Amino acid sequence: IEEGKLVIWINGDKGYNGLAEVGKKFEKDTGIKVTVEHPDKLEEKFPQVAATGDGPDIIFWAHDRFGGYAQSGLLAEITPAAAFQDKLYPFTWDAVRYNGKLIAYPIAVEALSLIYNKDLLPNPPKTWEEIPALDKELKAKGKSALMFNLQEPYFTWPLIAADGGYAFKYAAGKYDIKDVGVDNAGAKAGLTFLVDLIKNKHMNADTDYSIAEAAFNKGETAMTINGPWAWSNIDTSAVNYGVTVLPTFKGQPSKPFVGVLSAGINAASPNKELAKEFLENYLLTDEGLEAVNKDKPLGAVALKSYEEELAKDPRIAATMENAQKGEIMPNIPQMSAFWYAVRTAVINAASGRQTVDAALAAAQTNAAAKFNFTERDLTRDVDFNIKGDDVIVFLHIQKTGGTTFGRHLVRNIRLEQPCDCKAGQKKCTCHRPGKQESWLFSRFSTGWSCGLHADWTELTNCVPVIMDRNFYYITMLRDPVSRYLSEWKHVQRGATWKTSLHMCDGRSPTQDELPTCYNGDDWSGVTLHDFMDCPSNLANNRQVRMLADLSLVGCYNLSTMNESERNPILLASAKSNLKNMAFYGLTEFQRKTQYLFERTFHLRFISAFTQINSTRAANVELRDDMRSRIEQLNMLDMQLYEFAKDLFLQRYQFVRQRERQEERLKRREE
Ligand SMILES: O=C(O)[C@H]1O[C@@H](Oc2ccc([N+](=O)[O-])cc2)[C@H](O)[C@@H](O)[C@@H]1O[C@H]1O[C@H](CO)[C@@H](O[C@@H]2O[C@H](C(=O)O)[C@@H](O[C@H]3O[C@H](CO)[C@@H](O[C@@H]4O[C@H](C(=O)O)[C@@H](O[C@H]5O[C@H](CO)[C@@H](O)[C@H](O)[C@H]5NS(=O)(=O)O)[C@H](O)[C@H]4O)[C@H](O)[C@H]3NS(=O)(=O)O)[C@H](O)[C@H]2O)[C@H](O)[C@H]1NS(=O)(=O)O
Ligand SMILES: OC[C@H]1O[C@H](O[C@H]2[C@H](O)[C@@H](O)[C@@H](O[C@H]3[C@H](O)[C@@H](O)[C@@H](O[C@H]4[C@H](O)[C@@H](O)[C@@H](O)O[C@@H]4CO)O[C@@H]3CO)O[C@@H]2CO)[C@H](O)[C@@H](O)[C@@H]1O
Ligand SMILES: Nc1ncnc2c1ncn2[C@@H]1O[C@H](COP(=O)(O)O)[C@@H](OP(=O)(O)O)[C@H]1O
Ligand SMILES: [Cl-]
Ligand SMILES: [Cl-]
Ligand SMILES: [Cl-]
Ligand code: NA
Ligand code: NA
Ligand code: NA
């Protein structure tokens, strides 16, 4: 981000040419250039790039995205004088308050309305229920009743919410992120009506923003559902149109989620005072908002003076009527997960490929960030026969506490013939009773015989050969930010693991495939910033990479497929291989790890595992923005760990409760 300049991001459906005009006046008065951009998916790109040193100085979006940004430390707190604050409606400052603090400037209130062509339909329907009959009449004239974007849940939510659907329940002063209302009777009724419209061929499941707009603006459909920004193109096409209240469903109003277009300032911006000057003294004025509004209408603006001037517009009046009937959007971080979940459910239900009940049940799970596991997933029962051909394989991922765990395996298990660990020697002899065969494949028993820190790909291709059986794979996982910091500190003190083979499809990677991050013999002394800056850093997503079948993505050759394709494959492969292992533990749960290992393999340790909280990672002082960038560099590991933690904890509770019930039965039979 260049100092002395302003870079602004705003969505492509807003008045970015008018905003540019405000930017030109600012430049006239100050010599500060203002660049407006409208990149695609700006609301996903921003948390990826703000967490580094790129991104815009100012980001525009509806307020629902901003709590997530704020929780990640990506936004400067805004500090407007009480004088300026009173120039805007308090209603709209509420939309941009997060954990007590103001994190953006509110701009305008947006709500969806029903838009109709007065030359085809001078009185629009009051109910969703009468739309099928209307469409039948219109189809005989070569036209349709209604087309609107069915791909974005923003547009279908008003009907889904009408009879009772909700996102997160509000109770006791906060949003309950476990109480999700996307599969209740009301939500199901709303979505069923929409699905029936499609089944009865009054709408098409493929209709998106462009198709609906094109049809309405060409007079092919009598109605659409859209927001104030859409009015400009309708005027461009010279359609004679009205804007009115959304139809009712089962006698209740459609309930649009209400958005406040808001302007946040990047916490990494070196131009924060200029951003505040632009927003307060140029944009949030009658003149500035008029420039934007004349390009694409904002709706009901937040500035009291200019809102009063436009309030007579019946299109805005209709916008306010639908907004009062709807709900202000929560700004909490979980909003994005809600939207993603509903987006997928509506698409699959509307397509007919899944019923409403099944699709909304899946959305409920995803919106509440839950994991459903089968009994088989929670049951890991290994009749481990050390005298037989069973072999335990410990896959050690760097910096997951594998030294501690590996030492437990060779020093701390109660066995008739335990591992023979000679004093002052690194490895131990872990042989079956009376044989020269090992029962444990591990760093401290067999050594690195399949490669230094051999991963799932290397071990599954090498272990069966280098031992000739039942192989029981186990590993440890650690929360990725701590694991990444631990690896940074270890590399900073000389670790390279440069002799790892990284074998996959029968060869090690090429230097072009896997460039070294450092000059010389190691990367000692590296700062956290330079560590994070190397694109080929093997610390990034190490746990997913080392648990996945890397053949599935062309081994280490990043040109074989795109990231959008490689990333979901790696994650699903890692989740599957982890889940289907005999056992895994988590570094942060040493006692539960011990207990589950014991109950999985029917073994007992001599001395209790212990939790060490004062790790080198814990000692790193981590700003929130920097934690967020580490999460972004490790986004696959973040997802894997969330999955693994929940499975691990459900396994612990399952095994404990079974064991507690067995003890009781013993008592109740004596
Ligand atoms: O045998 C020969 O060929 C020798 O022949 C001699 O000449 C003659 C001639 C004639 C006769 N005669 O009788 O007539 C005899 C001999 C030559 O003079 C001589 O050159 C030649 O020697 C070669 O062959 C030797 C036998 O193989 C060999 O010596 C062995 O070396 C092994 C080795 O270095 O690998 C050694 O193994 C032990 O030490 C290793 C090094 O420490 C261990 O491996 C390391 O393990 C680390 C670990 O797990 O902690 C790992 O560290 C990394 O990961 C950890 C965990 O994440 C992290 O904490 C660390 O920070 C991280 N470090 S890193 O730098 O970032 O990687 C290391 O990476 C890994 O290297 C190993 O586990 C030990 N095994 S053991 O316990 O079983 O011993 C072995 O013991 C030696 O015997 C020589 O190396 C050969 N020399 S060469 O010139 O040919 O190369
Ligand atoms: O991978 C699927 C899609 O993912 C992306 O879209 C996501 C967004 O990232 C989420 O933030 C959310 O979008 C919400 C949005 O936050 C909310 O404000 C509202 O957006 C309105 C907006 O307020 C209004 O001003 C106008 O611009 O219309 C918008 C709706 O189009 O509602 C959104 C939900 O529909 O969830 C979506 C997924 O639905 C990504 O951007 C997509 O390209 C991608 O396909
Ligand atoms: N019982 C325990 N409880 C918590 N962390 C532990 C632990 N045993 C080891 N660790 C942590 O695991 C890391 C070592 O992992 P590995 O043996 O795979 O290299 C270290 O992290 P730090 O570097 O942050 O201190 C260490 O502190
Ligand atoms: Cl070794
Ligand atoms: Cl624990
Ligand atoms: Cl047991
Ligand atoms: Na160490
Ligand atoms: Na170096
Ligand atoms: Na800390």
Which residue is closest in CA terms to ligand 3's atom 23?
486
620 DSSP assignment: S
453 is catalytic: yes
Closest ligand 2 atom, residue 153 Cα: 35
**What residue type is assigned to position 266 of the chain?**
N
Method: X-ray
Q: What contacts 342, CB < 8 A, 6 or more positions away?
A: 153, 157, 160, 182, 363, 367
Q: In what order do the strands lie in the sheet with 241-244?
A: 144-146, 221-226, 113-117, 241-244
Tokens for 568? 């979901």
Nearest CA-CA partner of 625 in 32, 53, 6: 53
**Integer angstrom CA distances of residue 77 from 104, 269, 500, 536:** 7, 12, 46, 34
User: Taking the CB of residue 205, how many other CB atoms lie within 10 A of it?
Assistant: 19
Which residue is closest in CA terms to ligand 2's atom 34?
154
User: Taking the CB of residue 415, how many other CB atoms lie within 10 A of it?
Assistant: 13
On the 0-12 / 13-18 / 19+ scale of CB atoms within 10 A, 313 is middle
On the 0-12 / 13-18 / 19+ scale of CB atoms within 10 A, 307 is buried
User: Taking the CB of residue 367, how many other CB atoms lie within 10 A of it?
Assistant: 25
Closest ligand 3 atom, residue 478 Cα: 12
Q: Which residue has the tokens 């007590």?
A: 100
Decide whether any atom of ligand 3 lies within 6 Å of the 589 Cβ.
no
Binding pocket residue ranges, ligand 2, CB within 6 Å: 11, 13, 41, 43-44, 62, 64-65, 110, 152-154, 227, 259, 336, 339-340, 343
User: Taking the CB of residue 295, how many other CB atoms lie within 10 A of it?
Assistant: 18
Write down how long the chain is. 670
Which residue is closest in CA terms to ligand 3's atom 5?
612
Decide whether any atom of ligand 3 lies within 6 Å of the 615 Cβ.
yes
Q: Which residue has the tokens 């705003």?
A: 10
From ligand 2's centre to the CA of 572, what distance in Å?
25
Backbone φ/ψ region at 540: left (φ over 0), alpha (ψ -120 to 50), beta: beta
Tokens for 298? 């904002």
Task: Say whether 478 counts as a known binding-site residue.
Answer: yes
List the end-to-end C-alpha distance of the chain, in Å, as a whole number.
Answer: 75
Tokens for 284? 């949030």
Q: Which residue has the tokens 């990672």?
A: 617
How many alpha carbons fall within 13 Å on the CB side of residue 502?
Answer: 18
On the 0-12 / 13-18 / 19+ scale of CB atoms within 10 A, 230 is buried
| Catalytic pick among 63, 202, 453, 502 | 453
